[PDB]
Symmetry: D2
Subunit: 295 residues, 4 copies
Amino acid sequence: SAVKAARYGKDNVRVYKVHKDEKTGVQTVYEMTVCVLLEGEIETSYTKADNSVIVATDSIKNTIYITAKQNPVTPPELFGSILGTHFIEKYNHIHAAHVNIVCHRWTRMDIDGKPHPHSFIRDSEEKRNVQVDVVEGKGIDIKSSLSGLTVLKSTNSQFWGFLRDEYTTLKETWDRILSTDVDATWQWKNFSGLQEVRSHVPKFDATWATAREVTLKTFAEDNSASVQATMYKMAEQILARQQLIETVEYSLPNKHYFEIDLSWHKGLQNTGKNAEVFAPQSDPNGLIKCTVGRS
Amino acid sequence: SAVKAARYGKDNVRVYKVHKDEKTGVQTVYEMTVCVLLEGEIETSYTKADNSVIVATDSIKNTIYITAKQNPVTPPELFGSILGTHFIEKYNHIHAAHVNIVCHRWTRMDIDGKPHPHSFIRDSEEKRNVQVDVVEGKGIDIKSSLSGLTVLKSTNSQFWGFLRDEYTTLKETWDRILSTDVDATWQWKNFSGLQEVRSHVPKFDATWATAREVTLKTFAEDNSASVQATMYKMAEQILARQQLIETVEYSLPNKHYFEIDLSWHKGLQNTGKNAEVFAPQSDPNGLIKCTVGRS
Amino acid sequence: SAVKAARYGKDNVRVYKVHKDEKTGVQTVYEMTVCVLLEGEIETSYTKADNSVIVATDSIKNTIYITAKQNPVTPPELFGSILGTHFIEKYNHIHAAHVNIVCHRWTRMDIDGKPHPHSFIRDSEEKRNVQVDVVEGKGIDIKSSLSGLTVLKSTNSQFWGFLRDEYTTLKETWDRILSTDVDATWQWKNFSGLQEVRSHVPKFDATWATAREVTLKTFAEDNSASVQATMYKMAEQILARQQLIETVEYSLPNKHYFEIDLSWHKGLQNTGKNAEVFAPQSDPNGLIKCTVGRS
Amino acid sequence: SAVKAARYGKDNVRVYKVHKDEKTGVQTVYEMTVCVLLEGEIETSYTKADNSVIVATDSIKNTIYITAKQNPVTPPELFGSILGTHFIEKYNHIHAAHVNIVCHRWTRMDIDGKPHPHSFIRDSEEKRNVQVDVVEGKGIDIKSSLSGLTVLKSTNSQFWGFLRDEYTTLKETWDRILSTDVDATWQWKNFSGLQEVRSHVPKFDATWATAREVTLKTFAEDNSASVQATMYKMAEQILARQQLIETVEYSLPNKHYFEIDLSWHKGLQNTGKNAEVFAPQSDPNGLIKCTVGRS
Ligand SMILES: [Cl-]
Ligand SMILES: [Cl-]
Ligand SMILES: [Cl-]
Ligand SMILES: [Cl-]
Ligand code: NA
Ligand code: NA
Ligand code: NA
Ligand code: NA
């Protein structure tokens, strides 16, 4: 036997950081969950009990905190790039660092219509994420995403004209609920290293903003022919608005809301145009995915 | 042996309802999870295989949907009262109905700074809940709550002057993070039946609004001496603002954020006044509770 | 306003303990999650910022570990009694201690048909729990339970003869699947204090064993007329087998498995006697409860 | 823009099947969660609102149930192969089917030391899984796995000799707890189609058994130098015992159990050789991965 692939590190490292403006009194908080996995000339730790090649995961954890103390943790694309660069430069035998960051929301509270200088609310488990792969000799590959963005529209979703054969029982519809949990990823042009990442820092927050805005507006305004068609529209617009993105990926569940026929009870009409009460279905769910790139 | 208590019903009944204004085109959605448990002269179903006394849980489920179709589902206090009243009036041998409703957020989206007529976002897993106990001969007892309201303040929390003995290692502090998940319950005066509940309908939404507003403002503005002291302030104000409430209950975890001493690494200062990076702790957590009533 | 009730402490305290027999080499592990909430003359911590009455939750945590170091952690009924007794005896102003313990399974592995001296497997998330309320002047109240015991029988469950009216659509059946998650609680006679608890120590493990055995055998062997009827049989037998128990509580969801009519596809027969493939339903679910005591 | 990749289908399809031996009365149950995602000439559903190319996900769901009715659902490798083959053969324009199956445990109960003919227990959330990729022109690629296998050993784990630099604070140890959740995958030689899969059917259950046996025995018996070294040993042995496997993948978290220094309290000794009470840590955790193939 032989090692064909190996990576190891520390997962689920929770990190908080606060910024305090001494002058204004305004504090700003950041909270994330970090995973760092390293690759390199480490096979002998697996095959020969050779721990000398192991940068301890506990040290990896320490390094995350130390890096957060000495550097900005925002935008996460930059922080992840700094962190991954550290490992491959510090350790001659480590040749790749894989950094995943989940960013948790702490939105400043508005109290009596005024933003509060140090109090925050978790407005949703929606996450902003990055996957930053720092590979010696191959630059920095960044995938940015938003996830856990849960939405519903009560009309202006349709689904008709699909294939019908002996396995088909679904009725065509010209008016249904559409609800999903949005998982949207935008994949950046390869960066040659940390300098290039730094040169584009403002684009990270701006592109996340765009992705979220486009997602919401398209979902709300598209009289959807299918999840496929709507998600593609979202992806097209994001690519058109940021040339440094190469591809956009969407992964969308169709979280079904079923009509409930109540006509067995006193002739109650609750279907079609009379549909008011529905049964949200926990499972199963459609799952629709696509990766869109430039033509 | 003998049955000392018995209740049975349907749990986890997911319910959606839409309201459509034909004239404006504006649609409004509601989504909840309902549990209904009945009590009554049903012991023989347990002891003698006598299913004639069982209103099937599947029928209970149907009844929830039917009631939602024929009545407003908002405020949940009213809907729960209507539902529970139905069971004890419809079935001579059923003498209590216990209705729990979890209300899920569907906040109307703002697109290009305009509210969208039929698209919604789940802004947080914060829930609005009711527990409505309809008991024949004893009216309607309603407990209203908000839960899953997660907040953090980065300063203006303190904890000193607590008991110190041979089991104590916690250092006193004059400046710490405070983060919690708010579980707040307001218990209404008993109502004699559905008419009385109906007579107060506007107070349900208004009191939920007050409870949430007071919670957020007190959390943000109180330079907290302890979780105990802050939560009490919240409870006092809610009672002062709605005389139909008899008691206010808070259940608050203290979700710890630990300082990280980095001085072992290059003399880095990250404690006390220099504390910027912290380790959020998943467990354990303080848990602080109180029920406040009128003096 | 005034405090009507108050309790506070540390939740989610994870605890592991190992026993090592130096002579045999056999190691035995225990893992639990502990919650301790105290009550007493502590209202001024809520109303007057008086932290002198607060035994810090962090000290409560320390105390849990210290108690685990100096005492057996098994059976959990004893450990909880020792822990709660400590708080009310140590602190004059603390008059009640509420101890909840969740015990996690670490079953010794069998390797090559021989029990291994120090390796364990989590065979299920089934838990063994205790709720131990130590109240000054009122002894020790113990509720013991098993939870998360998930079972299924593929036949020998029936449900017919239930009430049928205009809200009923459920068909009667003489052969259905029954699956549940068992939550079973046995409530002990009040104990006057720690000595009395100690005098009965062997009965705690033996009664848990009995409760589990009776539950499984009755579930497997009862041709069930209803969940109500089956659970009552379980409760009767436990009470008959341990006189120090006063009541038995069961809380059982009916986790539905629906038939799937496939006759629309090539006349496939998959209902009634031909039913082979079913759709497990995540929600809703029946929920059936009862407390059984002595006649 | 253009579609670079696309796949869609039904996720979270829960499936139960029962086998009843009319002659013996012995019933056998199977429960799984199925996901099927299709690829093919479907881009126009995304780009041109062309739903004619969509095999509805609801039809995919129906097909899963129908296939389960007409075929064995065990071993899951075979069932997944049959299912995926169906889609690519039935639909000219569908060229790949990706089938994921999660198998849930229903272990026959032993009542009074005799196996019960129709009652089962979920002994753990350990899963047996398959990923079966049926690609037209490229056969059937199967990855089999076990997951959620949670284990602990209380000694005979070590970790010393790792790299030490200015980021290192972890002390070397010659005796620690090791606990993990095992995720083990064995990747089969490509099969040319369904016939070849069928020709090897007995090897699927036997190799799963081997993987599990080797995992448990190696974990229990290896005086572990590191997670890396132990997992490699597991992978080597599985490859040696089934030549139709090409690679073995392990993904193992190191779920830390920290010592607790209690010497501040009455000089209590609870570290090193005196360590009895530990604090299980929910996060962070080491994460160790490797893929092992043939030299
Ligand atoms: Cl779908
Ligand atoms: Cl606390
Ligand atoms: Cl039921
Ligand atoms: Cl580790
Ligand atoms: Na390097
Ligand atoms: Na009645
Ligand atoms: Na006392
Ligand atoms: Na095809």
